[PDB]
Ligand binder design. Sequence first.
Ligand code: MG
Ligand code: MG
Ligand code: MG
Ligand code: MG
Ligand code: MG
Ligand code: MG
Ligand code: MG
Ligand code: MG
Ligand code: MG
Ligand code: MG
Ligand code: MG
Ligand code: MG
Ligand code: MG
Ligand code: MG
Ligand code: ZN
Ligand code: ZN
Lengths: 150, 87, 136, 61, 386, 131
Amino acid sequence: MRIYQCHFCSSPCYPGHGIMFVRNDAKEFRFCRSKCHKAFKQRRNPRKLKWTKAFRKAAGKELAVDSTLTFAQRRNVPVRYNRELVATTLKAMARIEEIRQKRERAFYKNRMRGNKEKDFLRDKKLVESNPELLRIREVEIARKLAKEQE
Amino acid sequence: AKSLRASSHLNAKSVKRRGVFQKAVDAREQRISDKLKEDLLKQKLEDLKKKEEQGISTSGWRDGRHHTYKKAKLMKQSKKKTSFTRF
Amino acid sequence: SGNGAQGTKFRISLGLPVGAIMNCADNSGARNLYIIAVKGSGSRLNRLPAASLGDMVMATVKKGKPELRKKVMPAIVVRQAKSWRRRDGVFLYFEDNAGVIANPKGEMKGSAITGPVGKECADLWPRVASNSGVVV
Amino acid sequence: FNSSIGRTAQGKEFGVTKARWPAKSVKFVQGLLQNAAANAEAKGLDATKLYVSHIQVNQAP
Amino acid sequence: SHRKYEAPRHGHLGFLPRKRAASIRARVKAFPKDDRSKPVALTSFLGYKAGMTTIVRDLDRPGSKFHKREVVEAVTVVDTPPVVVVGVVGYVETPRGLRSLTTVWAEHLSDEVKRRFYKNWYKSKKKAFTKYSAKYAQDGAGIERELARIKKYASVVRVLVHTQIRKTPLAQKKAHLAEIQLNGGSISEKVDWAREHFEKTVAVDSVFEQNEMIDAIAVTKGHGFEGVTHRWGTKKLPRKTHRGLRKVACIGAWHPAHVMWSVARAGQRGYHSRTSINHKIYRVGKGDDEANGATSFDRTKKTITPMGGFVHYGEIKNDFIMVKGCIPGNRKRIVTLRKSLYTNTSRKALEEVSLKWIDTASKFGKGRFQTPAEKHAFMGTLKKDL
Amino acid sequence: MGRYSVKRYKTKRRTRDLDLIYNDLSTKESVQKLLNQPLDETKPGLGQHYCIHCAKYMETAIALKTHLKGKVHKRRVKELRGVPYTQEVSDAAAGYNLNKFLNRVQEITQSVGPEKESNEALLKEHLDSTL
RNA sequence: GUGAACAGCCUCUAGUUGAUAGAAUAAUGUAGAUAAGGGAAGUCGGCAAAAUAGAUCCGUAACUUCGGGAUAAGGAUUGGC
RNA sequence: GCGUUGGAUACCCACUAAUAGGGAACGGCUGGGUUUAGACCGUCGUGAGACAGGUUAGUUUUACCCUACUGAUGAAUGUUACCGCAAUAGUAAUUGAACUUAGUACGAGAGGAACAGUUCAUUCGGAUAAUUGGUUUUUGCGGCUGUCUGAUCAGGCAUUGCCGCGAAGCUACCAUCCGCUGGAUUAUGGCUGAACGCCUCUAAGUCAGAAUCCAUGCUAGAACGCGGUGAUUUC
RNA sequence: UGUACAACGGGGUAUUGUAAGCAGUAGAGUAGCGUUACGAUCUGCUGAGAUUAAGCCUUUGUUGUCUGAUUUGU
Ligand SMILES: [Mg+2]
Ligand SMILES: [Mg+2]
Ligand SMILES: [Mg+2]
Ligand SMILES: [Mg+2]
Ligand SMILES: [Mg+2]
Ligand SMILES: [Mg+2]
Ligand SMILES: [Mg+2]
Ligand SMILES: [Mg+2]
Ligand SMILES: [Mg+2]
Ligand SMILES: [Mg+2]
Ligand SMILES: [Mg+2]
Ligand SMILES: [Mg+2]
Ligand SMILES: [Mg+2]
Ligand SMILES: [Mg+2]
Ligand SMILES: [Zn+2]
Ligand SMILES: [Zn+2]
């Protein structure tokens, strides 16, 4: 039993999900969804479709190179079973996942800084450019306050 | 091919059935009975804990309603001649 | 399951009814195989016999060597384009339908098989697994 | 006159399965009932004790 | 003259007539044979079909091609909160068959089971069993006499139980009440068990256990009026045939001058009573287990409920039964689980199930994640999260 | 689902993939082998006039020249420029075999890339000379 | 307007908004579509559908009354800026 | 009891456990045929025409009636509600392969079983939608052509405009699951035993034994078969 | 007259594929005086925006509703 990643969008492929295509050169293409399978059959570029992890990594929407991302790789050289080593691995997986989530959050925040400054500049320009609507707003507020007073 | 009603196959099935399958069934029944008794005992204990805070002849008719209804029904059947056992 | 097969066979979705044409995956000189019969097929009115991966069929060579043509020979299906379910938990399919020429004992006429070979067929036929270079 | 008529739950009041809502017939009968009530009032009868003691429909040409 | 080509008939003549079932709860027609030496036990249980999901099984089946291998199998989930024992019925044997002699009820009945006796609960004065409850006063005369009558004369003992439908996500508030045969010791012991269990609950793991073959009795999903082609599986007529092609071309061509009862005709499809047998229990999950959806191979802490809940049903917050394969009925229908009528002689009844993984992805779409935490970890940080 | 997409991208009507075409173009020996093919009667133009990028045979040299003077061939050449998107790309995008994917990208940038570009330039000038 | 075009589709002027209606969406129909893998194995019979199709370029056989066959066949292309 | 096929043009080819014969016609669609008017060739006839013949083209269009059959309501025997019984009627499973027995019995050899214990599949049947696939008026999301609303935005029409994806529902040997066990027998093999001082399976009696019969199990539930149980009206 | 019901709203769960608007120095070039103007497209704010029961799940919020008609007795 093993979780696979989709060839097109890198989403997890749990047992009994998606479909696999085998090419003449023995290459297995596993797709989590009929959507990804049909996109592959139509020969679209996953690095051009914005909803794929390939596009996100290529465009820098999420972090791609990190020390937390080197703990998972295919082990072609097996190791003898050890109960304490298994317990240590199980604890380490949770710790690494927590650290990776924190680092991804920091990466997103660093990417999205500046939005508040841009929004404030846009709001200032709109307020400076619309005087008549502000006068209507002031009249409405004053009439509402007079209604509340009386 | 031998049918589901084939005598030799059914005899072999009975020979198999009197052994390990019946042993497994009996063991499962004993375990289920033990769990049922434990479930009853746990319910009794919880009811007792909840109440801690708060603190034969079968002859004749069943009841008067049954007597009245059955007498009326038999009289109705006798009057209408719709009785199964009595003329 | 046919003479020469190694054990029982679980059901695979049928993709090749009678009249289908598949490629020839061995090196005996045949190019394609035209299915005229399916070994081990059942009997039902109006229903065409159909073969899946790992089945033995009776086929005639349409393209290839003229010595191989105009004859009926046993073949074993090694690839199919119709998707089928594996018990490990995925549906899968190949690019094309492909078979190899064999004998009634399940022994290959050719010496090697080009392209991938299905796991089910390789496990069911020892000679296919012996002549396969790629097994899934 | 109820061959090949649909079935409704509103017929269970009268113990039937086939009932309808003939609007034109109901309006004509309502007009005649109103006229009969007016005639009874003109005669001076008690309106609360009146019941339809006879009603008859015949085929006109 | 003879038909030129032989073919089997379309459909089963033993499942006639194909009419709608008389009730939404299917009747149990046969209970397991009573062995007087065994301890007292219920012969059946009641539950609600919640939905289906997928498992991975580490199969141990000697002689099989999938011995020591993993198999992906479909399962059915039945929500089974504990039933409540509220009555007992005695049956005597007559030359005309079994006859119910007497029925004894418990002192207190909940409104959930009282609603079963009403068509208009909100307008009613809720007077059910009010005078009956007065018979328990001053040493329970009458109640004791009827229990003694059951002990003296009855040859079959059944217990009246009802479901706790208020624990399910269902919008229906009216509970389901049914008779379950008591198989076990003597008649007196059965009566004593019923009297002691009055107003008490019975859980599903005190009736069934894992690796057991059971039977599912239920009414199938209805489909209304259906033609012969999909009702009986008949072959379609050629294209643009006059008077339709989804028909049987000739319903009679011979002497009897009638339509035979064995000829396919259009009519009701579905909503029929069915009793399917030999469904293996893959898991008896407890409602208080925080990881009843986890295994020894899958260490993720999760419940049996899929993401977004079961479609059209909801979440599973009670004890549940996971059996392999499919059972008759659709989701949220009441089903009866019955003990096997015979000792099964197949090795599958002796096989022990060890699940490696249970699917909990969303059934409302092409679900790719097992938990919302997994979905969040895969997607990352969104606009609204910052 | 729709008829056009079904009858174009049916399984039996599949075409050669971009990564395989990239591997064909990478080595000079493979380019020479595809340029010098045995005369096959089952291929258009006796197996001659074969565009490697589009993996397409032409019946005539003028047909090949007109295909080269076309936007479809330019689209294929534009597609064949970057990384061919093997399974390692999706694995590293999911967070799997990241070092292997980075090493593959570095090898493509250093060794495979410029040699493939030079082979493409040589093929282009050879087609221009022979056409 | 698009387009070779009194074609098809949309619009201005002008002119209509007429044809018993309302509520549900079973089977069977009438009219119109889609379909995995195989591809005529169906049927007396490829009936019916599907496939093709505009324009530009390359190229086009037997036969022939030398006028044709011919758009024979078989290939490549088409947007926007 | 249960099956008895797929094709080619009465015979062949193949698959298969097998491709047995026949009756309810020969006492609904559909091709050959009764095919009337058109036409051509052949034979005969002085001719109108006929035929030893051969070819081609050629309108007949119910059901809403009664019954039968399939499904669906329903008055009345105090009212109403819940839980049940089972007369009767129907009934269902089928075939092949594989491991082991075993390269064992048997056999100069060449070859070569079965019972007991296990695993799959064919045909049929009943379900089911977790997964895969099909389907799209979810007109859900996006895109494209032409035109129209001054342009952007947002939209109309193109008798579902077209294209891609598409949940939900429905659905597929294109998907998955499930489909049993007691009595009595047939042919036959016997026991005791006369007829008949031998003998004898039969005469009296009696033991086993078929995919057979009747039951178990499954479906319906007599709307004029039945039982147990709850409540039973303040103008 | 309430783990009451309904209409909205909120949170999940799914479908699609990155909204309107603003900006850039990215943009084949062309015109005028390195700059400006036009410019398919590209990039950022933006897995954004839109839809989500009509037969999906859940709900410490808002607003309302709880009512008419007929009949039945041993
Ligand atoms: Mg046929
Ligand atoms: Mg009508
Ligand atoms: Mg779903
Ligand atoms: Mg198709
Ligand atoms: Mg044919
Ligand atoms: Mg035929
Ligand atoms: Mg010609
Ligand atoms: Mg004529
Ligand atoms: Mg019977
Ligand atoms: Mg045996
Ligand atoms: Mg079916
Ligand atoms: Mg438009
Ligand atoms: Mg003797
Ligand atoms: Mg009855
Ligand atoms: Zn994917
Ligand atoms: Zn090219």
